[PDB]
Amino acid sequence: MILKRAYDVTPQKISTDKVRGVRKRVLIGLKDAPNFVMRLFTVEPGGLIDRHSHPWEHEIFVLKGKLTVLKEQGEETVEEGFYIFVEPNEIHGFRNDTDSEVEFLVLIPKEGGE
Amino acid sequence: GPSGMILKRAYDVTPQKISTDKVRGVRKRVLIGLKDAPNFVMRLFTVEPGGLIDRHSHPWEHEIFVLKGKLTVLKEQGEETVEEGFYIFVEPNEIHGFRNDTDSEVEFLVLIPKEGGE
Numbered sequence: 001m002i003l004k005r006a007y008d009v010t011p012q013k014i015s016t017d018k019v020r021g022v023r024k025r026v027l028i029g030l031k032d033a034p035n036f037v038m039r040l041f042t043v044e045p046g047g048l049i050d051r052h053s054h055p056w057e058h059e060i061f062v063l064k065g066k067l068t069v070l071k072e073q074g075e076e077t078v079e080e081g082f083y084i085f086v087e088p089n090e091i092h093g094f095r096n097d098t099d100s101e102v103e104f105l106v107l108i109p110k111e112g113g114e
Numbered sequence: 115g116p117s118g119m120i121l122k123r124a125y126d127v128t129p130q131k132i133s134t135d136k137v138r139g140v141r142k143r144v145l146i147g148l149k150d151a152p153n154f155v156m157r158l159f160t161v162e163p164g165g166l167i168d169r170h171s172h173p174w175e176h177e178i179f180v181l182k183g184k185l186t187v188l189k190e191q192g193e194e195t196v197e198e199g200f201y202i203f204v205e206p207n208e209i210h211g212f213r214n215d216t217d218s219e220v221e222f223l224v225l226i227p228k229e230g231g232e
């Protein structure tokens with residue numbers, strides 16, 4: 001059994017053509033998990049995960065702040081205490097328009113989970 | 115399967131009592147359930163003050179994230195308390211349980227492969 005403070009997992013900064021101002025923690029990876037993985041994303045003020053899609057779903061829980069969710073068209077803001085279910089293949093992305101860090105949990109099946 | 119995205123306040127789901135021979139003082143909200151999940155389900159558990167999920171095991175894993183309060187985790191040997199911001203991975207077949215020794219509600223997300231139900 002693994003019991004750990006998520007913050008203590010070292011985050012990985014991401015800065016690419018599609019993702020900026022984001023870091024990622026792998027909490028439960030496929031080293032441990034047989035079916036699905038658990039990650040925690042932190043999005044700095046102005047950070048962006050641009051629209052994309054996958055062959056797999058996302059299950060998300062918003063832990064902190066106000067998260068802007070990019071949809072195929074348009075966008076919707078949600079806050080801490082929301083969950084999000086992204087069907088396979090659905091276009092999605094994220095932005096933080098606020099002045100503080102936004103955090104959300106993201107779980108994906110193992111095929112996405114490397 | 116279907117397209118789209120569901121975005122919902124978790125508290126818009128009513129917390130239902132869990133009532134079994136091994137659980138007392140616990141409620142659950144099904145967030146992403148069997149009707150929708152391709153692979154795994156997401157529930158939000160609320161442990162009332164003094165609530166208890168006795169030690170048990172099952173042939174599927176748990177992935178847990180603690181949202182609120184101080185959660186006592188029962189292990190095969192002994193126990194450990196964690197708090198908001200901790201995650202827990204429980205291997206298939208590993209003995210585990212939970213207790214709330216505090217005065218206030220403890221909440222945690224619990225995800226399992228959908229073969230284990232909701």
Ligand SMILES: [Fe+3]
Pocket residue numbers: 052053054058092
């Ligand atoms: Fe994605």
Ligand SMILES: [Fe+3]
Pocket residue numbers: 170171172176210
């Ligand atoms: Fe269990």
